[PDB]
Structure formats: C-alpha cells, structure tokens
A paper describes a structure:
At the molecular level, kinesin-1 is a tetramer consisting of two ATP-dependent motor-bearing heavy chains (KHCs) and two light chains (KLCs) that in mammalian cells are encoded by three (Kif5A-C) and four (KLC1-4) closely related genes, respectively, with distinct cell and tissue expression profiles. Regulatory KLCs interact with KHCs using their N-terminal coiled-coil (CC) region that precedes an unstructured region followed by a cargo-anchoring tetratricopeptide repeat domain (TPR) and a disordered C-terminal region that varies considerably between isoforms. While vesicular cargoes interact with adaptors that can bind to multiple sites on both KHCs and KLCs, diversity of recognition is often mediated by the interaction of the KLCTPR domain with short disordered peptide sequences on the adaptors. Using a structural approach we show here how kinesin-1 selects adaptors, like JIP1, that rely on an alternative 'Y-acidic' (tyrosine-acidic) motif for recognition.
Residue numbers in the entry:
A (entry chain A): 214 to 436, 460 to 495, 702 to 712
B (entry chain F): 2 to 115
The structure:
C-alpha cells in the first residue's frame, strides 16, 4: 500500500517523468506476481489514468480506467465502493471532455452504489452528488442541481469541517450553477461567504477593525487555490454591476494571494 | 455539537407556529442549517435549508410560500415561521447540520387538527 501513497505525492509536485515510470514498473511487478485480474493492478491503473488525465492524455486515461473497472468488478464485486470510485473517475473524464450525456449514467451508478453501501450520510455520497450536479448543469438540466449541492454541502460541513477544501469546491460549483442561471445576486452571496470563512479562519471574527476583502471593496466604491477563482469571479460580478472600484480591490487581492467569468468546474476524484 | 428545538404545538388548519433551534458547541455562523421533519408513519423528510448569513434559502415544494426559514447568528438560533399549516405538515420537527438529521436534538411536535 506504501507505493500507492508515494505516486500521488510525486504526481502532486508535477513530477510526471518520475510518477509515470513508478506506476508502469509497479504494474510490471504486479502482473508477474498476481497477473492482470488483481485489485492492486486496478488501483495502479486508476492512479496512472489520473496522472495521464492531468497530462491531457485522455485517450490513455480512458483506456486504463475502463480496464481498472472490469478488473474491480471481477476481483471486488459489482457493488464494491472501489468500482464506484472508478465509475466516478470515468464520469469526471467524460465530463471534462464535454460528454455530459455519456457521463451521467456512470455518475448515477456510482451514487447508487455509494448510497447503498456507505449510507446516504457518507462524504463519498457528497462527492458523487457534487459531480452529478456539475454534469447536469452543463447540460442545462437545473431541476435537482441546487438540491444536490445543498445535500452535498450538509454532508461535507458535518462529516469534515466547514474549512475542508471539499466545502469551498462544492460552494464554488453551486455559485457557477447560479451564474449559468443568471442568479448573479445568489452567486455574489456565495462568493462572499467563501471569502468571509477564509478571512475568519486567518484574521479572526468580523468586526469594524477587522473586515473581509469584499467589505473593504464596497467601502471604496461608496467614496487555497479555490479562493483565487472566488476573488476573480466576485471581481467580475462587481464589474458587471458597474462597481469598478470594488472590482479593483479584489483583483489587487487575487494578484497578492497567487504570487466574462472564470469557468473552472471542481470535479472530485475517486 | 448541541441543537435544541422548541416552538411546537397544536393548531387548526390555517394556523401558525414558529420553531426555534438553540445551537451551542460549534461555530454556528460558519454552518448551513437545515429543518427536517418526520411524520407519524413516514421516514425523515427535508423541509428547509438556509446558508450561513441567511441570503440563500431553500424549501420543500409543498411548504414554499407558507414556511420561512431565518437565523440570528448573534443569538446562535435558527428559526422556522410556519404559516397556513395543513394536516400534511403534522410531524416531529428537528434542526440539523445536514439533510440526514445528524446532530439533531429531541425535536418538537407539530399537530394540525380541527
């Protein structure tokens, strides 16, 4: 299991010249020890596929994921949570390529497995609901999208913390859902909430002598990587309202924090 | 996490109740809050959702325009104004940090009769 934890670490740094031969050589060892149809082979195929996807090698990523899926269905079972993790990775892959119609049934199968096996309260259910809502909104099917978001948000803040990265990602996705629907005020409210929580976690509780960035922006007008896209998207919302001095305050903060709207959907892996 | 519900009672169809939920032991203002209900012989149903500040609200289709969720972050309290109450709304009501009813209190009984 140690090796699985080592590759993700090398991949996170963007060391593809080291991460890819690590997976390949590990898969070479496993196929000589326990053959092709073994759970550890499917685990390594799954991680390498995600490494390929990050390198824009989608053809390769799809091939390994479909292979890992067939292995996991055989070696672990059709209703195993590891099958749902691979089904999700396939849905996310199709979703990232615009194949929302093809991605939706895979996402629904993964959700059904995770609800039945882990319970309707598990963080992995919130993961699938978030991805399902993302695949639905990009099709223009808004019917149950906001319901999935508020359901996933409840699970994430309860099981993990309200400061957990999955909470901010799901919130940014719901705010993108509001933008696609022309709900500019609700998107503004949600982006302000993310920035308030980020301000409270670092500089403390909000008062007169300690205000979040968006509060200082509105004063001037009167006279985590997710936060950068939150700062940019709220800045663009102010620009649309004709509030340019408020828009400048956020752009200044987005520049310092780094080193129409920003379309970046946060899909949650495995 | 400590949530305590109050405000339940017996009313006639068309009547009103205001549910309260006292919160302690957590950063309440950083959480989205939920109202959930369980009718005598049915499973737990989601009723309403409110964001941290109260700028975003959501309701079950059958309670839209009759129910109003609100919150007082300084008082660490969640509210549910229930107007034009119907027999279908008769249930045990709970407040929660999710739709499943995790961290819910003992609830409060709502009865709609005569």
């Amino acid at each position: 299991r140690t090796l699985h934890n080592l590759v993700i670490q090398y991949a996170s740094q963007g060391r593809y010249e080291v991460a890819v031969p690590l997976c390949k050589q590990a898969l070479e060892d496993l196929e000589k020890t326990s053959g092709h149809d073994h759970p550890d082979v499917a685990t390594m195929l799954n991680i390498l596929a995600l490494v390929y996807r990050d390198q824009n090698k989608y053809k390769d990523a799809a091939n390994l994921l479909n292979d890992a899926l067939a292995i996991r269905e055989k070696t672990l079972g059709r209703d195993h949570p590891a099958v749902a993790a691979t089904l999700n990775n396939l849905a996310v892959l199709y979703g990232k390529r615009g194949k929302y119609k093809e991605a939706e049934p895979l996402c629904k199968r993964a959700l059904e497995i995770r609800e039945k096996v882990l319970g309707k309260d598990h963080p992995d259910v919130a993961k699938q609901l978030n991805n399902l809502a993302l695949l639905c909104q990009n099709q223009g099917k808004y019917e149950e999208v906001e319901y999935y978001y508020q359901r996933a948000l409840g699970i994430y803040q309860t099981k993990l913390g309200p400061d957990d990265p999955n909470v901010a990602k799901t919130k940014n996705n719901l705010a993108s859902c509001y933008l696609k629907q022309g709900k500019f005020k609700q998107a503004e409210t949600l982006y302000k909430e993310i920035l308030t929580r980020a301000h409270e976690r670092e500089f403390g509780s909000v008062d007169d002598e300690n205000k979040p960035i968006w509060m200082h922006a509105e004063e001037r007008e009167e006279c985590s990587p997710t936060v950068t896209t939150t700062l940019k998207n709220l800045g663009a919302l102010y620009r649309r309202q004709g509030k340019f001095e408020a828009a400048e305050t956020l752009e200044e903060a987005a520049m310092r924090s780094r080193k129409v709207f920003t379309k970046l959907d946060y899909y949650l892996d495995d | 996490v400590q949530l305590q519900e109050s405000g339940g009672g017996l009313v006639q169809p068309g009547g009103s109740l205001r549910l309260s939920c006292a919160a302690s032991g957590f950063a309440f203002s950083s959480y989205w809050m939920y109202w959930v209900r369980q009718a005598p012989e049915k499973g737990l149903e989601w009723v309403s959702t409110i964001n941290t500040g109260g700028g975003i609200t959501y309701y079950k289709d059958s309670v839209k325009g009759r129910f109003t969720v609100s919150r007082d972050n300084a008082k660490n309290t969640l509210y549910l104004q229930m107007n034009s109450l119907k027999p279908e709304d008769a249930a045990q009501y709970y407040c929660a940090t999710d739709m499943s009813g995790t961290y819910r209190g003992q609830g409060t009984q709502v009865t709609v009769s005569s």
